[PDB]
Amino acid sequence: MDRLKALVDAAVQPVMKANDIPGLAVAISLKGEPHYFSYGLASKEDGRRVTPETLFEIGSVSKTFTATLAGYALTQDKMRLDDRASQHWPALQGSRFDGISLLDLATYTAGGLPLQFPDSVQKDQAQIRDYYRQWQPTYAPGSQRLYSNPSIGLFGYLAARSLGQPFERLMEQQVFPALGLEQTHLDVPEAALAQYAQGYGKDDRPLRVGPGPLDAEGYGVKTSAADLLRFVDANLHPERLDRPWAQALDATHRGYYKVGDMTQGLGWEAYDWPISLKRLQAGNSTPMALQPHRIARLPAPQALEGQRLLNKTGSTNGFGAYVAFVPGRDLGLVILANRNYPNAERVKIAYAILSGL
Amino acid sequence: MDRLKALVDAAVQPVMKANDIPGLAVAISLKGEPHYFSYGLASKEDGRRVTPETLFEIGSVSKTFTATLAGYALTQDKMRLDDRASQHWPALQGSRFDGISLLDLATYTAGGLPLQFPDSVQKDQAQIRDYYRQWQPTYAPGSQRLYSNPSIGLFGYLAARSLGQPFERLMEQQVFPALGLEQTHLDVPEAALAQYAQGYGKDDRPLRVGPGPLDAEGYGVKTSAADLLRFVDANLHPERLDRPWAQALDATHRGYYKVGDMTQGLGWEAYDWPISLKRLQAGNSTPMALQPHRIARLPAPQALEGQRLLNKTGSTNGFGAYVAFVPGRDLGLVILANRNYPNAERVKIAYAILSGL
Numbered sequence: 188m189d190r191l192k193a194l195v196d197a198a199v200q201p202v203m204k205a206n207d208i209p210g211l212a213v214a215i216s217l218k219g220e221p222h223y224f225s226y227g228l229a230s231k232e233d234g235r236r237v238t239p240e241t242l243f244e245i246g247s248v249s250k251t252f253t254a255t256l257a258g259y260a261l262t263q264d265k266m267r268l269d270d271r272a273s274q275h276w277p278a279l280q281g282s283r284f285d286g287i288s289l290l291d292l293a294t295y296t297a298g299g300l301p302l303q304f305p306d307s308v309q310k311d312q313a314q315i316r317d318y319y320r321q322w323q324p325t326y327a328p329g330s331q332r333l334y335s336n337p338s339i340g341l342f343g344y345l346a347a348r349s350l351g352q353p354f355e356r357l358m359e360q361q362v363f364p365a366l367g368l369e370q371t372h373l374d375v376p377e378a379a380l381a382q383y384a385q386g387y388g389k390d391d392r393p394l395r396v397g398p399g400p401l402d403a404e405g406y407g408v409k410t411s412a413a414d415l416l417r418f419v420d421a422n423l424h425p426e427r428l429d430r431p432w433a434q435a436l437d438a439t440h441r442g443y444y445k446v447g448d449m450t451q452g453l454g455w456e457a458y459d460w461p462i463s464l465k466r467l468q469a470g471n472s473t474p475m476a477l478q479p480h481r482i483a484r485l486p487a488p489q490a491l492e493g494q495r496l497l498n499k500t501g502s503t504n505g506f507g508a509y510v511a512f513v514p515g516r517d518l519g520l521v522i523l524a525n526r527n528y529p530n531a532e533r534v535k536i537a538y539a540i541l542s543g544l
Numbered sequence: 545m546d547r548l549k550a551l552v553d554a555a556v557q558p559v560m561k562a563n564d565i566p567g568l569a570v571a572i573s574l575k576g577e578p579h580y581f582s583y584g585l586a587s588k589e590d591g592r593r594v595t596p597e598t599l600f601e602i603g604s605v606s607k608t609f610t611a612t613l614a615g616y617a618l619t620q621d622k623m624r625l626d627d628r629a630s631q632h633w634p635a636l637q638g639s640r641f642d643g644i645s646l647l648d649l650a651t652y653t654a655g656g657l658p659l660q661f662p663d664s665v666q667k668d669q670a671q672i673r674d675y676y677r678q679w680q681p682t683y684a685p686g687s688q689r690l691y692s693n694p695s696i697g698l699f700g701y702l703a704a705r706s707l708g709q710p711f712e713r714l715m716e717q718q719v720f721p722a723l724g725l726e727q728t729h730l731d732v733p734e735a736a737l738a739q740y741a742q743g744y745g746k747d748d749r750p751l752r753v754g755p756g757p758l759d760a761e762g763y764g765v766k767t768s769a770a771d772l773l774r775f776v777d778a779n780l781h782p783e784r785l786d787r788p789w790a791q792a793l794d795a796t797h798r799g800y801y802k803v804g805d806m807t808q809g810l811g812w813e814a815y816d817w818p819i820s821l822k823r824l825q826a827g828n829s830t831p832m833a834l835q836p837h838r839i840a841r842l843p844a845p846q847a848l849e850g851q852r853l854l855n856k857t858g859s860t861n862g863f864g865a866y867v868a869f870v871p872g873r874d875l876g877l878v879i880l881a882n883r884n885y886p887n888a889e890r891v892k893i894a895y896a897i898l899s900g901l
């Protein structure tokens with residue numbers, strides 16, 4: 188494995204140095220076997236080292252887990268993607284969500300739901316409900332992609348409602364276990380807190396993510412490199428799971444439209460593979476997150492398999508994560524850092540590694 | 545026996561409906577007498593009905609047969625569980641299998657051998673050998689249980705080598721006949737193909753298991769409900785076979801360590817009986833098959849008899865099998881289906897039946 192070791196060292200170390208990244212865990216799945224590389228410090232104050240068991244905040248990578256729950260709800264015939272959103276929450280009946288579908292919410296095409304909830308919306312059922320009740324669209328549903336936590340957040344919350352339980356309960360009791368995961372959480376238990384890395388912000392201050400409205404659905408997962416690769420491996424081989432959970436994962440591997448080179452799935456975003464580093468970086472750039480883009484809608488849902496790269500970026504104030512896999516090559520990659528360093532740099536590491544596998 | 549009929553019907557029918565199972569064969573050994581219940585279709589195409597003679601793929605239940613061959617090798621003083629793996633295959637000498645025991649391989653504690661051979665390893669001796677020669681442990685031997693086909697596959701293969709014959713020949717010529725079995729096969733003969741059920745996959749496609757490296761050892765057995773109950777009955781009363789085969793069966797009823805509620809034997813996995821449905825389901829859950837678990841090693845091997853439930857689950861892309869017995873209550877159960885439906889559902893059927901006996 189010294190060959191893989193040399194490749195990963197060469198990819199990681201220059202970027203860790205250039206971005207002053209205290210700690211970074213890599214997990215690679217190659218030819219059906221895991222490989223771990225654990226760099227630096229989980230905490231600068233007490234000098235705890237990064238291991239494959241260190242817990243990191245993965246931020247928006249959480250959307251892939253949220254998509255998995257929604258996938259399950261489909262397999263159980265509890266909801267359908269063409270359902271009107273308000274079908275699954277009576278409180279929204281009569282609002283604009285009578286005419287917005289679950290698919291629109293999942294794929295950020297509801298009509299201009301913002302990146303975040305207004306700063307005034309606290310983590311509170313009534314305030315979240317009221318926000319959606321009063322929300323006035325900027326566009327007609329299904330025409331403009333605008334990356335949005337309130338959009339996919341609602342999708343996840345409605346999936347939970349369709350299954351008749353809180354989102355958090357379903358994730359902790361059903362989803363994580365069904366995926367073969369045991370070190371993956373929405374709220375890190377007391378027993379595992381010693382594994383929780385410290386995050387380091389823009390100003391080098393220690394930071395951990397605080398609560399917010401629909402945080403669990405949008406950006407709330409904490410996990411290790413080892414457990415996140417287990418998730419990637421389930422995505423590569425959904426047959427490691429029970430039938431309905433295999434089907435749930437399959438549902439997150441279906442593309443609905445294109446923006447530039449990117450095909451939008453549930454949570455996952457896909458690309459042809461190979462693709463240039465420059466194009467992959469463009470798909471993961473700040474304008475992709477912050478600008479609205481017209482969508483090019485596929486005539487039918489497209490299976491995101493074969494020679495394709497499926498990926499997701501995620502950040503919190505103190506953390507930067509990236510996950511990617513190539514279904515047709517059985518390659519899987521996880522890079523978790525305890526600094527929020529640029530998306531382009533994460534893609535740089537991933538590309539250098541994947542290019543050499 | 546309409547009373548047993550009422551119990552079995554009530555346990556089976558709802559689960560068949562819920563999981564869209566085309567065909568399911570139940571065989572129960574109660575107080576030393578067999579009872580068969582045969583539901584639905586062995587093939588949806590030609591409407592052939594399930595009978596106690598229908599052949600199903602039992603997947604990982606095959607491991608109990610593999611363990612029995614190893615049990616025989618032990619009785620014939622051809623190998624010992626403490627033996628270094630490479631003692632029984634000179635080709636592995638100089639590899640990590642110089643420091644891994646037969647017991648490690650049998651009980652999935654070699655140090656991180658994966659669930660499956662990499663898809664790139666073909667059913668070929670050289671490729672299988674090279675895989676093992678190049679393999680590097682994630683963990684120290686004897687410390688972590690990670691369920692693995694290459695692991696127990698090697699155990700069975702090495703047992704065969706110790707006896708001086710191919711694994712397939714030993715199973716067909718010696719093991720199956722010794723157990724009184726005539727409808728149990730690694731490869732179904734032409735004469736019996738009309739009995740071989742069609743399997744039905746995740747997507748409802750007609751599926752039968754295809755060849756793979758060490759498939760015979762890990763998951764390759766096809767058998768009927770009647771023949772598999774005959775095997776269960778041999779397990780309940782080993783003294784019913786020739787002395788060496790009685791001893792071979794006894795060897796598979798010895799526990800070496802615990803993980804949660806489960807005591808690990810050779811092939812067989814054991815629990816106290818009675819135990820809650822919830823706990824029995826956890827023992828047969830996805831995290832059990834996919835997560836590494838630190839083992840709690842027993843001071844000496846524990847005889848798996850009296851008030852205990854010994855069981856094994858098994859699946860292929862198109863089939864789902866479950867077998868269980870309670871030595872101290874002389875109870876035996878076989879449930880074979882031609883759909884790979886969730887482990888928890890199989891346990892639900894079995895628990896409902898066993899609790900009513």
Ligand SMILES: *C(=O)N1C[C@H](NOS(=O)(=O)O)CC[C@H]1C(=O)NOCCN
Nearest residue numbers: 246247248406476500501502503504530
């Ligand atoms: C997800 O991690 N997001 C969404 C967005 N950036 O998109 S990404 O480049 O695809 O990750 C803004 C940052 C981030 C969060 O919202 N993270 O949650 C912590 C602050 N709300």
Ligand SMILES: *C(=O)N1C[C@H](NOS(=O)(=O)O)CC[C@H]1C(=O)NOCCN
Nearest residue numbers: 603604605763833857858859860861887
């Ligand atoms: C055995 O049937 N296995 C082992 C594993 N699941 O464990 S079990 O729940 O104890 O059965 C994965 C699936 C399955 C197979 O490997 N089946 O053979 C076909 C794929 N190699």
Ligand code: NI
Nearest residue numbers: 423424517663
């Ligand atoms: Ni594959």
Ligand code: NI
Nearest residue numbers: 780781871874
């Ligand atoms: Ni008895």
